[PDB]
Design a protein around this ligand. Structure first.
Ligand SMILES: [Mg+2]
Ligand SMILES: [Mg+2]
Ligand SMILES: [Mg+2]
Ligand SMILES: [Mg+2]
Ligand SMILES: [Mg+2]
Ligand SMILES: [Mg+2]
Ligand SMILES: [Mg+2]
Ligand SMILES: [Mg+2]
Ligand SMILES: [Mg+2]
Ligand SMILES: [Mg+2]
Ligand SMILES: [Mg+2]
Ligand SMILES: [Mg+2]
Ligand SMILES: [Mg+2]
Ligand SMILES: [Mg+2]
Ligand SMILES: [Mg+2]
Ligand SMILES: [Mg+2]
Ligand SMILES: [Mg+2]
Ligand SMILES: [Mg+2]
Ligand SMILES: [Mg+2]
Ligand SMILES: [Mg+2]
Ligand SMILES: [Mg+2]
Ligand SMILES: [Mg+2]
Ligand SMILES: [Mg+2]
Ligand SMILES: [Mg+2]
Ligand SMILES: [Mg+2]
Ligand SMILES: [Mg+2]
Ligand SMILES: [Mg+2]
Ligand SMILES: [Mg+2]
Ligand SMILES: [Mg+2]
Ligand SMILES: [Mg+2]
Ligand SMILES: [Mg+2]
Ligand SMILES: [Mg+2]
Ligand SMILES: [Mg+2]
Ligand SMILES: [Mg+2]
Ligand SMILES: [Mg+2]
Ligand SMILES: [Mg+2]
Ligand SMILES: [Mg+2]
Ligand SMILES: [Mg+2]
Ligand SMILES: [Mg+2]
Ligand SMILES: [Mg+2]
Ligand SMILES: [Mg+2]
Ligand SMILES: [Mg+2]
Ligand SMILES: [Mg+2]
Ligand SMILES: [Mg+2]
Ligand SMILES: [Mg+2]
Ligand SMILES: [Mg+2]
Ligand SMILES: [Mg+2]
Ligand SMILES: [Mg+2]
Ligand SMILES: [Mg+2]
Ligand SMILES: [Mg+2]
Ligand SMILES: [Mg+2]
Ligand SMILES: [Mg+2]
Ligand SMILES: [Zn+2]
Lengths: 357, 206, 60
RNA sequence: AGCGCCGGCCAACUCCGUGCCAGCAGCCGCGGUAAUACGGAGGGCGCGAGCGUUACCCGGAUUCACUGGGCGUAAAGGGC
RNA sequence: UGAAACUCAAAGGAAUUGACGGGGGCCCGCACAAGCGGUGGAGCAUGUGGUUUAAUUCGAAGCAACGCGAAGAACCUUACCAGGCCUUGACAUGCUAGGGAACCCGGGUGAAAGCCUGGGGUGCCCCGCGAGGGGAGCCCUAGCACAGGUGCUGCAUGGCCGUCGUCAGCUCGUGCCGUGAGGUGUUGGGUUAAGUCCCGCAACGAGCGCAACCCCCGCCGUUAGUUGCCAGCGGUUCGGCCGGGCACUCUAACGGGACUGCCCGCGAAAGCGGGAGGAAGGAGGGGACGACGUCUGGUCAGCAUGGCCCUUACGGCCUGGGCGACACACGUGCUACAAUGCCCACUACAAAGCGAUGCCACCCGGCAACGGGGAGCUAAUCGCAAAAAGGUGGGCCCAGUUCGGAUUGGGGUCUGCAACCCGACCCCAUGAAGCCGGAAUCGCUAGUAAUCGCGGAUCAGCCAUGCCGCGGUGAAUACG
RNA sequence: CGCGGGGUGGAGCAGCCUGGUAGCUCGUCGGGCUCAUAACCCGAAGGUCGUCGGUUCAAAUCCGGCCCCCGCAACCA
RNA sequence: AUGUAA
């Protein structure tokens, strides 16, 4: 089977030369070598950085796909020289330096996973109904259970966080915690609206019926609740209270105002007779105003998700699972697997790996 | 949907078997198989003739195939040329005394399987299926039959939506045993797919 | 896996157990009658056709 | 020698590609895998130094009805 | 008093045919009621959903999917998975190039498939004593065209089937009514299992259905008398055993018989009620038989077949594994929970079928499965075969038990190349749940339900408690 | 450290003061009725009693410390 | 009480 475990390294390298543009990097690496050779290249050492480390960023690409096309050809002659001589050491020595090139190739395939800051966080998966109706709430449930079987395969945690079962039959919404390694990297290329076309069991006269559902994936960042505030940027003002009180309100600076310098937020207090029973309050309320603003940043980011996703609607598919003629076209890339009821069982590798490009 | 085959329904009442002989537990299977091969070979080669019935008889170690056809000449050949040519091709497979006869089909337009292959042929010729069917039923009634019914099922005219067209005249009492009704089936292979044909001719209440 | 099998069922085996009836008309492996060499479907088709000698619709 | 068109209105039909996508559209409506309705091709129809489109006017509109319409239930008898 | 922007390709009026109504009237069907026995609870068998898995191949989805395609999955089957393999192929036809090719026999390697090989030897048919060239069915390696696919679409299809529904209906021809869709006939009154028939009628006829003609069971007759049967005599070693006879019973063909035919009563008739005769009476009991159409019903995995897809692979061979998994969930069944019962000994009465490495009488060995002898039988002669309930006698005495046989240990028999996964049977021991089952729910109106056994197809064997048949015993209840 | 009332299954609440049993409604899981859902019917699962420290043979319960929570109070200059 | 969307 070893001559078939080098044939899979020939396919994994061609797909690596296709998306990475083996020609637009063999060419770009040549223009960097033409500029850095001149000793008069250190004229603005900032420019030399983005070229000297870029040349090492293109020599980790061009030169690696050169030692994979030549290194595997030297193994196609080393495995037939140990069979026709009964030499059993030439055959331990043509696979050892073959599994090291399978790591040089597997490492360079992590130019698909190393494209997203932090692609190992125990991500979450949000499937929502919408479109189709009761048919799609069934469809959203089938798409729910499908990803569960997916995570069952590659080895993750499937903790459902939040559900909402459909009114008639099905699921309106689900949140799954995909706790694992490279978890966000895998499911990241699933963010979209999956389309289902089939005979609806819910339609009175059993017609052919389209129903949509979405899956949205985000990684895991933590609480990020309260933020520290040192008095080095707070400016506490003091003055006299206003209104009733008598003499002990005329000669007493009992009211306080705490103005935060970088934020620009002001806050006062004057309730109690003591300046520091008021300053206690003014720190309290001040914590509150910063907690509001730092909240408003995140809710603004929340609406950024809402306003950039959308919309579990018709002209909005990424993949189309049509069960009435047995096909699942991923109109993004796009594969055309005919095993509909095998993808619904969790064979999304056919799509994930091919759609990380 | 429902209706039972009208010939299989009258065997030994109004209708007679087409392979008539005896065989025991130990022999029956092998005789029947080659017998169908006899039916197999002849069904293709004798189509051009207008093959209607295939009666077959057997006596200890010898078998006689009596072929009904509308155009006997097309079967026998030139002065008896092919009828001999066939008997040898036949009894080659058979390996026994294969007396190969021919018999007249007095009025093919009262033979249901014949009427059926006509229309099946007609619609492979891209004819107006309704016209074919109306035509077919009219001759069969002209030729004196007390009743006739013809139906064709499939992509009629090539249409994507399959449909069934039939036409009938006089009586066709499929529930009555004592009514003699010939039945026949013909498969029409087209560019867009297969069409099915049923022909019912009511010869009489015998 | 059909024609290879409508064929292989004819061919002699490694052990006499591996032999099995296929319907000589359509190649069916199930409900093959020894007496006819036919499956229940072919048996019904021919019987109605009248091409089974002595065989008839049984009514009692 | 070019321009429009070839589902019905309305004259001119088949092959491939696409697969409620890309797109068409004056109205009815086409496209969710075998589309004479989308794109191309072949073929055809209509005009020809032009051919289409858009805007506007009259016509069809007898749909403001003098020619030449209506009002029980369709729009419409005033509460008397 | 009274706009507009915007927006829609309609909003509407009447009437037609259906469908529906928590509208009416008149009807029918184990639909209910009236009863009998169950399912749901237990244990197990089986199918399914899930989940599990390298794969646990696929289809079936309310009725009408779920002991269904599967009327026989250890390998085969097998369509899935893993690995070892094959490229003109396991199979069809037609070529091109170089060769003998037949056909039979072995070696090594290997889990097999396969791979690498060593041999005998095409007798064919044209010239000749002949060397010898020449025929070609047939093989080897190549190169071809091709084959091959249980891969997709039952929403492109044929065929076949399920279903409403054995329901009483669905239409046509001519005529008449309406601008028209359409109506009339087909409605109405009576009757029937029925659009069954009678009468009436702008209808008059006609077709597909209904009924009948077909099959089994009932009574009787004719023909026929062994391989079947003995009423009578003989012999009878008691076994129709032998003679002898074909009456019987029987067997299997052919007919007869039932048609509301006859009497009484109601009625216009059709028909309805009662009585006789009769084996049988109002359709005698059961079967076959399924209208135009419905469910864009089921089946491309029986087969056929358009289109689409795979060609060192989505083809093909093999070995092994899987289809038999198991936290659970549902359907269908088997065995039960006991005294109208269980067990033991003895002892009667069936039918329909099957039978040549088939059934296997009788004998011997073994507790037994079975093994070893060995008669008979192309089957009314021989065998499977004991029918079981029942009957007679005895034991048990209400106890999770002489109930109940699940589970498990051990020891075997047989089939088969091979019983680890994964066969059935026998024996010893083990002796679980289960004390009559929640909500809910099924079948059956007479030889029916209940209960009791027997046979067959499939099949080496068998996971059959399934299915298709067969007879034995034999109820309850139907006001409505 | 103002006074006094609380924190109990998923939600909302009883049970404390008289120490040994945690109960009610909804929800939830399984089964039914339905062509299907809701409603309805049968059956089930479910709680460190906010914590930390121990009193008592024994703490949801009695007594302190801390953590949040609701209500009241914060007056005379 | 309800049953969307070819
Ligand atoms: Mg929701
Ligand atoms: Mg349905
Ligand atoms: Mg004051
Ligand atoms: Mg002061
Ligand atoms: Mg077998
Ligand atoms: Mg034009
Ligand atoms: Mg035209
Ligand atoms: Mg096209
Ligand atoms: Mg065009
Ligand atoms: Mg156009
Ligand atoms: Mg105008
Ligand atoms: Mg005008
Ligand atoms: Mg006027
Ligand atoms: Mg007007
Ligand atoms: Mg009005
Ligand atoms: Mg008025
Ligand atoms: Mg008014
Ligand atoms: Mg007035
Ligand atoms: Mg307007
Ligand atoms: Mg109005
Ligand atoms: Mg109206
Ligand atoms: Mg009604
Ligand atoms: Mg009932
Ligand atoms: Mg009842
Ligand atoms: Mg049970
Ligand atoms: Mg399939
Ligand atoms: Mg079985
Ligand atoms: Mg195998
Ligand atoms: Mg269909
Ligand atoms: Mg069909
Ligand atoms: Mg299907
Ligand atoms: Mg008429
Ligand atoms: Mg009419
Ligand atoms: Mg009618
Ligand atoms: Mg009518
Ligand atoms: Mg009639
Ligand atoms: Mg008699
Ligand atoms: Mg009768
Ligand atoms: Mg009938
Ligand atoms: Mg369908
Ligand atoms: Mg196996
Ligand atoms: Mg007896
Ligand atoms: Mg005996
Ligand atoms: Mg017992
Ligand atoms: Mg008891
Ligand atoms: Mg009844
Ligand atoms: Mg058996
Ligand atoms: Mg049995
Ligand atoms: Mg306690
Ligand atoms: Mg429930
Ligand atoms: Mg405390
Ligand atoms: Mg609602
Ligand atoms: Zn068959």
């Amino acid at each position: 089977p070893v001559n078939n475990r080098i044939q899979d390294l020939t396919e994994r390298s061609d797909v690596l030369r296709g998306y990475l543009d083996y020609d637009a990097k063999k060419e770009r690496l040549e223009e960097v070598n033409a500029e850095l050779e001149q000793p008069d290249v250190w004229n603005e050492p900032e420019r030399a950085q983005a070229l000297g480390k870029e040349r090492s960023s293109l020599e980790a690409v061009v030169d690696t796909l050169d030692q994979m096309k030549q290194g595997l050809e030297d193994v196609s002659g080393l495995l037939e020289l140990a069979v026709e001589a009964d030499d059993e050491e030439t055959f331990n020595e043509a696979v050892a330096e073959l599994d090291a090139l399978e790591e040089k190739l597997a490492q360079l395939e992590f130019r698909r996973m190393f494209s997203g800051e932090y692609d190992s966080a125990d991500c979450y998966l949000d499937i929502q109904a919408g479109s189709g109706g009761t048919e799609a709430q069934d469809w959203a449930s089938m798409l729910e259970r499908m990803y569960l079987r997916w995570a069952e395969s590659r080895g993750f945690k499937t903790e459902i966080i939040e559900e909402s079962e459909g009114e008639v039959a099905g699921i309106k919404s689900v949140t799954i915690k995909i706790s694992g390694d490279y978890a966000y990297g895998w499911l990241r290329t699933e963010t979209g609206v999956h389309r289902l076309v089939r005979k609806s069991p819910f339609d009175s006269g059993g017609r052919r019926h389209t129903s949509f559902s979405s899956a949205f994936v985000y990684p895991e960042v933590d609480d990020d609740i309260d933020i520290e505030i040192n008095p080095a940027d707070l400016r506490i003002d003091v003055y006299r209270t206003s209104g009733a009180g008598g003499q002990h309100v005329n000669r007493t600076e009992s009211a306080v105002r705490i103005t935060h310098i970088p934020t620009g937020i002001v806050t006062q207090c004057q309730n109690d007779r003591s300046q520091h029973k008021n300053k206690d309050q003014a720190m309290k309320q001040m914590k509150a105003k910063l907690y509001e603003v730092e909240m408003q940043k995140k809710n603004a980011e929340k609406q950024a998700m809402e306003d950039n996703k959308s919309d579990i609607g018709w002209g909005s598919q990424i993949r189309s699972y049509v069960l009435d003629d047995s096909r699942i076209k991923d109109l993004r890339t796009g594969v055309e697997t005919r095993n509909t009821q095998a993808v619904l069982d969790g064979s999304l590798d056919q799509f994930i790996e091919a759609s990380l490009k | 949907g429902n209706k039972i085959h009208p010939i299989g329904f009258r065997l030994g009442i109004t209708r007679d078997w087409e392979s008539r002989w005896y065989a025991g537990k130990k022999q029956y299977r092998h005789l029947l198989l080659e017998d169908q091969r006899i039916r197999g070979l002849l069904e293709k080669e004798l189509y051009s003739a207008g093959l209607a019935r295939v009666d077959i008889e057997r006596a200890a170690d010898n078998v006689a195939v009596t072929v009904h056809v509308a155009k006997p000449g097309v079967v026998i050949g030139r002065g008896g040329e092919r009828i001999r040519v066939l008997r040898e091709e036949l009894a080659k497979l058979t390996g026994k005394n294969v007396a190969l006869n021919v018999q007249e089909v007095q009025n093919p337009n009262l033979s249901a399987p014949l009427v059926a292959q006509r229309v099946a042929e007609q619609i492979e010729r891209r004819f107006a299926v309704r016209r074919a069917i109306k035509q077919a039923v009219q001759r069969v009634m002209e030729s004196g039959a007390k009743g006739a019914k013809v139906i064709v099922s499939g992509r009629i005219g090539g249409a994507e939506q399959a449909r069934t067209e039939w036409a009938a005249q006089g009586r066709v009492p499929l529930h009555t045993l004592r009514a003699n009704i010939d039945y026949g089936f013909a498969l029409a292979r087209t560019t867009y797919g297969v069409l099915g044909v049923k022909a019912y001719i009511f010869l009489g209440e015998v | 896996a059909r024609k290879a099998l409508i064929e292989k069922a004819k061919r002699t085996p490694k052990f006499k157990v591996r032999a099995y009836t296929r319907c000589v008309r359509c190649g069916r492996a199930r409900s093959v009658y020894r007496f006819f060499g036919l499956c229940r479907i072919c048996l019904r088709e021919l019987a109605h056709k009248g091409q089974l000698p002595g065989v008839r619709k049984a009514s009692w």
